[PDB]
């Protein structure tokens, strides 16, 4: 037998925040706990809210790669590519893309993205029924608005075309 963890395979276009949240919820860890295990401290707790004041470094991502067992390049593929500007707030979601695959796309957080290219829908910045801003992607235990308990996949037919 060899040391192991509840590994999670990353999605396509998922966020670093959402992937780390899924990794934590499948390992019953905590942001401080994940950081301490990785060896980088509370920096992880920062990444879950997209505060990349000092962009996630190559070392700070290799240390994560050692723990979550995902290749460092595959890790960088959930951060915005070098030079692309993202908004850490508000957290934005497309209902149809969540119904297709239950994840949060880092591409939704780009400053330049307002339309889902494969759904032709104006992506959502707040819950379309109760105007409740979405939580951090790592905090999505499941696909529902916290205040109104409306499933994320449902919101697809409330969001405008």
């Amino acid at each position: 037998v060899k040391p192991w963890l509840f590994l999670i395979k990353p999605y396509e276009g998922e966020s670093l925040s959402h992937f780390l949240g899924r990794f934590r919820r499948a390992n019953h860890l905590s942001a401080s706990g994940l950081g301490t295990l990785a060896g980088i401290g509370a920096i992880v707790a920062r990444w879950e809210r997209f505060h990349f004041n000092p962009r996630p470094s190559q070392q700070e991502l290799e240390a994560i790669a050692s723990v979550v067992e995902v290749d460092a390049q595959r890790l960088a593929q959930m951060l915005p590519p070098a030079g692309v500007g993202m908004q850490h707030e508000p957290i934005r979601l497309c209902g149809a893309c969540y119904a297709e695959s239950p994840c949060h796309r880092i591409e939704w957080q780009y400053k330049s993205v307002w339309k889902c290219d494969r759904h032709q829908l104006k992506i959502l910045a707040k819950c379309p029924n109760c105007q409740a801003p979405f939580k951090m992607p790592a905090l999505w235990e499941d696909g529902c608005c916290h205040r109104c308990r409306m499933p994320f996949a449902e919101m697809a037919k409330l969001q405008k075309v």
Binding site: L5, L29, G33
Partner: protein, 260 residues
């Protein structure tokens, strides 16, 4: 043959596992309770067993580990330390399956160990020396057995029976039992022979269950197998230390005097 002498001593210092009727009975009983997923309580006497056989049972069902997936270990054998708390039990479970998290809140640690037990496909949980944990951990053990459908085997002496009889629910969870006996009677006549040919494997002295050595062996070991192991291994060590090819009755009397 000095180098041969420490070669023999290195061979003897290890603890070889002789097959016996008790170990096979325990293996079959444990297999039945595992297929039934029924919690049981092997009450026994000290030095009679419940460790060599129980540990051998985990070796019987060797864990298989995929390169990048959780292992599937059917039997998890742990030995809680003295007055172990719930965190100690959870950490023993976690460390046995070679999980790679070792810190966290006790509630989070409980959730983690439940998840590893469900994920590693564990079915039998052997708690050896179950006389070394508080009743609160017993409650946790009750919860484990109830939720995960695990066959939980409580291993210990009769002090374990005394400890669990003071709690209503723990008594009912583990009414099933299996007493380890002392084999007082016909079984030594073959146990001495098996111990002399295989684990000893020294030059045969034609001992052949002689009543002369059988009397002193009964008067010394009294029926505990571990006592027999200590006596016979020390006797062989002393016999080779003075260079005697066979194990004479003089060294048997010497080791008997040392023990009693």
């Amino acid at each position: 043959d000095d180098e041969w002498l420490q070669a023999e001593i290195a061979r003897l210092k290890g603890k070889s596992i002789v097959p016996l009727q008790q170990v096979k009975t325990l293996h079959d009983w444990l297999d039945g309770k595992r297929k039934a997923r029924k919690s049981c309580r092997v009450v026994g006497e000290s030095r009679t067993g419940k460790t060599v056989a129980c540990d051998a049972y985990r070796y019987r069902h060797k864990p298989q580990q995929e390169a990048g997936r959780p292992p599937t270990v059917p039997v998890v054998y742990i030995r809680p330390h003295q007055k172990c708390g719930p965190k100690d039990l959870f950490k023993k479970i976690t460390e046995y399956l070679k999980y790679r998290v070792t810190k966290g809140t006790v509630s989070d640690f409980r959730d983690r160990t439940i998840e590893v037990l469900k994920g590693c496909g564990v079915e039998m949980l052997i708690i050896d020396e179950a006389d070394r944990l508080k009743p609160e951990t017993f409650a946790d053990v009750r919860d484990i057995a109830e939720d995960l459908g695990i066959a939980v085997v409580l291993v210990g002496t009769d002090r374990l029976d005394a400890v669990i009889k003071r709690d209503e629910q723990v008594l009912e969870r583990f009414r099933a039992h299996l007493r380890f006996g002392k084999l007082s009677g016909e079984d030594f006549k073959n146990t001495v022979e098996m111990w002399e040919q295989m684990v000893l494997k020294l030059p045969v002295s034609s001992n052949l269950k002689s009543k002369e050595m059988l009397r002193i062996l009964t008067s010394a070991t009294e029926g505990y197998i571990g006592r027999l192991d200590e006596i016979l291994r020390e006797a062989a060590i002393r016999s080779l230390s003075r260079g005697l090819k066979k194990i004479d009755k003089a060294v048997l009397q010497e080791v008997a005097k040392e023990y009693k």
